[PDB]
Amino acid sequence: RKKEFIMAELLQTEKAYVRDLHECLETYLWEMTSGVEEIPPGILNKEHIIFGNIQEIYDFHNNIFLKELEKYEQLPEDVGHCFVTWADKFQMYVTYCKNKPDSNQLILEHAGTFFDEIQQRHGLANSISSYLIKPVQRVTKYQLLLKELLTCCEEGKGELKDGLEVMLSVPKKANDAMH
Amino acid sequence: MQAIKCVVVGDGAVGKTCLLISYTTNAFPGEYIPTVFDNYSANVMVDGKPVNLGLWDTAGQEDYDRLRPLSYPQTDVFLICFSLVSPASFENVRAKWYPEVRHHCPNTPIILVGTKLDLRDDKDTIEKLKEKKLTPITYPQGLAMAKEIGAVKYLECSALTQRGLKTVFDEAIRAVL
Numbered sequence: 533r534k535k536e537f538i539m540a541e542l543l544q545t546e547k548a549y550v551r552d553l554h555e556c557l558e559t560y561l562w563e564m565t566s567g568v569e570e571i572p573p574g575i576l577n578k579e580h581i582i583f584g585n586i587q588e589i590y591d592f593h594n595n596i597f598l599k600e601l602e603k604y605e606q607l608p609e610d611v612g613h614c615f616v617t618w619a620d621k622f623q624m625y626v627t628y629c630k631n632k633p634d635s636n637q638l639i640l641e642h643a644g645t646f647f648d649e650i651q652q653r654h655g656l657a658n659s660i661s662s663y664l665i666k667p668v669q670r671v672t673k674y675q676l677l678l679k680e681l682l683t684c685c686e687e688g689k690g691e692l693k694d695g696l697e698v699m700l701s702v703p704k705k706a707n708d709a710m711h
Numbered sequence: 712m713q714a715i716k717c718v719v720v721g722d723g724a725v726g727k728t729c730l731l732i733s734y735t736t737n738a739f740p741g742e743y744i745p746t747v748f749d750n751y752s753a754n755v756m757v758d759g760k761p762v763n764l765g766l767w768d769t770a771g772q773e774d775y776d777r778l779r780p781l782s783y784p785q786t787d788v789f790l791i792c793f794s795l796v797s798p799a800s801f802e803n804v805r806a807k808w809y810p811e812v813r814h815h816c817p818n819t820p821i822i823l824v825g826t827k828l829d830l831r832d833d834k835d836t837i838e839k840l841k842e843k844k845l846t847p848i849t850y851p852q853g854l855a856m857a858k859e860i861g862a863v864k865y866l867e868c869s870a871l872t873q874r875g876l877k878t879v880f881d882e883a884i885r886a887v888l
């Protein structure tokens with residue numbers, strides 16, 4: 533029962549995370565790239581500083597990682613293996629975290645109400661800032677979920693220990709990469 | 712209408728995720744305590760002045776000293792939390808939380824929140840603490856901590872019973888207006 537609630541949350545929160553990044557890319561990013569709206573000289577052609585590699589993180593989750601987590605739905609005790617298989621893809625969270633400070637100042641110093649206007653226009657409860665923290669939040673949440681499964685899975689749970697190792701190793705490497 | 716960013720900081724032992732879920736759903740989640748609370752906004756009226764309240768969790772980032780501050784900029788108010796039945800969590804207000812919150816957001820209102828009020832009068836909890844030569848954190852300890860960190864308020868609450876919980880968030884808003 534507990535291993536089933538945790539797996540269900542893992543999957544449901546993975547879907548919301550893909551939906552959230554998608555929302556971010558097709559509103560806040562799409563306005564900057566469109567050429568449908570007037571763009572503060574301050575941020576112009578600096579979408580790569582603002583959004584960092586979030587495109588590639590979305591692609592990972594949306595192309596691969598949600599499809600693979602789904603396959604482990606009836607195999608919660610094994611799901612640590614999903615993280616092992618895809619450990620390299622998670623290295624993009626290191627790039628993303630390094631860049632986030634630069635992203636945030638740029639938006640303060642140079643974007644005025646550009647994104648606030650798009651937020652109002654599109655009807656979004658989440659600010660561009662609320663969206664841009666999510667990759668940081670998500671990469672530090674996987675280790676919580678894996679620990680929860682470790683509290684309620686048998687000695688058949690080195691198909692968790694090595695998952696958790698990976699998902700402790702990524703956020704520390706991302707942490708240790710900050711200036 | 713006024714937007715308010717509220718970040719919730721403190722040890723794993725506070726039950727940050729559970730606090731925010733029990734606040735936003737008007738219920739202790741009981742069966743299963745979810746590990747994920749996603750960034751949240753909701754219109755509330757405070758002193759008859761409607762406000763858009765934003766709540767961000769930080770659960771999972773307790774070991775990443777350089778990742779946590781990524782949420783800090785442009786925060787209107789911090790809840791700095793400890794569990795009333797974790798002396799360690801209480802000391803970490805002084806040792807860990809207040810320093811990094813001051814370092815990055817010097818002029819931002821802090822509410823000091825003691826969580827798990829329902830466990831301060833619980834025999835098993837009390838006894839478990841006595842075995843480590845400890846007691847729960849009492850009211851004057853929180854007041855004295857609040858003063859020391861420049862907290863605008865010290866408040867005690869239970870996610871379980873909902874006691875003091877709504878007041879915590881009312882006061883977070885009041886500390887900004």
Ligand SMILES: Cc1cc(NC(=O)Nc2cnn(CC(=O)NC3CC3)c2)no1
Pocket residue numbers: 725726729730826827828829830835836868869870871872
């Ligand atoms: C915030 C806030 C208040 C609150 N109160 C809360 O969680 N109370 C509660 C009731 N029964 N348990 C299980 C438990 O921990 N039992 C003892 C360790 C053996 C916990 N939680 O978050």
